[PDB]
Amino acid sequence: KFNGLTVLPPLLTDEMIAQYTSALLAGTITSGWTFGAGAA
């Protein structure tokens, strides 16, 4: 991890991924397939 090797962070943090899965799940529950086609 120090012979010229490095690990870079992801662009979206685990909390930003969890906001996306929450938004997908809350869209699915409250509005059916409609939020994929247009407005929820």
Partner 1 sequence: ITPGTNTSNQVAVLYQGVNCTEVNVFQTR
Contacting residues toward partner 1, per CB under 8 A: 6, 8-9
Q: How far apart are CA 10 and CA 26, in angstroms?
A: 25
CA dihedral 38→15→12→1, nearest 10 degrees, is: -160
CB of residue 7 to partner 1, shortest distance in Å: 8
Name the residue nearer to partner 1 (CB basis): 9 or 38: 9
- Closest C-alpha to 25, from 12, 17, 3: 17
- Residue 18 Cβ, how far from partner 1 at the closest point, in Å? 17
When the beta carbons of 3 and 38 are compared against partner 1, the nearer one is: 3
